[PDB]
């Protein structure tokens, strides 16, 4: 987030929100890759 101790903590939670969005998108990509292998078999 582009727009001293307060600044940092606000940026860390903004990251902690984005991580929960990424974590989900990993397993979604796994399912996708694991489907490509299944479809072929």
């Amino acid at each position: 987030h582009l727009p001293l101790d307060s600044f940092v903590q606000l940026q860390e939670e903004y990251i902690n929100s984005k991580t929960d969005f990424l974590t989900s998108k990993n397993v979604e990509v796994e399912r996708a890759v694991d489907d490509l292998l299944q479809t072929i078999m």
Partner: protein, 155 residues
């Protein structure tokens, strides 16, 4: 994920506001092929996190047909394999708030359930393979449904 046998997506419905969530039911329409004590529960997905379901709709029996109600934002109503009608709330979910009586509600499974949008407090209609169409009141499940029509052919 890790269910006893597979469960067929018996019916789907979209969220009335916009394409953000998709409520889906799960039951076997093959006769007696459903296992003894299979997991009877509908889920509701969000298009942001499609890994696992956003919220669970725990039911007494397997849910055959569900739909969203445009009148009351997030009030899903569903027809079970037993013949029972159920209604949940899409925010809190969990257990069903309105459930029909066992004896007066029709035999054999709800083949279709739709909301009667044209009404102040919403009403719902329901057909079956028993061949008895019914006009239910959501506020008042009371002593059975309001209207009973049996589907005669030919006169």
């Amino acid at each position: 994920e890790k269910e006893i046998c597979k469960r067929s997506v018996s019916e789907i419905s979209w969220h009335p506001e916009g394409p953000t969530k998709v409520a889906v039911s799960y039951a076997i329409m093959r006769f007696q092929q459903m296992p003894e004590k299979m997991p009877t529960q509908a889920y509701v997905w969000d298009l942001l996190n499609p890994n696992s379901p956003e919220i669970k709709l725990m039911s007494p029996s397997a849910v055959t047909n569900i739909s969203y109600n445009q009148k009351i934002p997030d009030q899903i109503g569903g027809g079970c394999y037993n013949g029972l009608l159920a209604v949940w709330d899409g925010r809190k979910g969990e257990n069903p708030i309105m459930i029909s009586p066992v004896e007066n509600s029709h035999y054999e499974p709800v083949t279709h359930f739709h909301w009667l949008m044209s009404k102040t407090g919403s009403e719902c209609v329901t057909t079956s393979t028993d061949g008895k169409v019914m006009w239910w009141d959501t506020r008042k499940f009371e002593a059975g449904p309001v209207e009973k029509l049996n589907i005669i052919e030919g006169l």
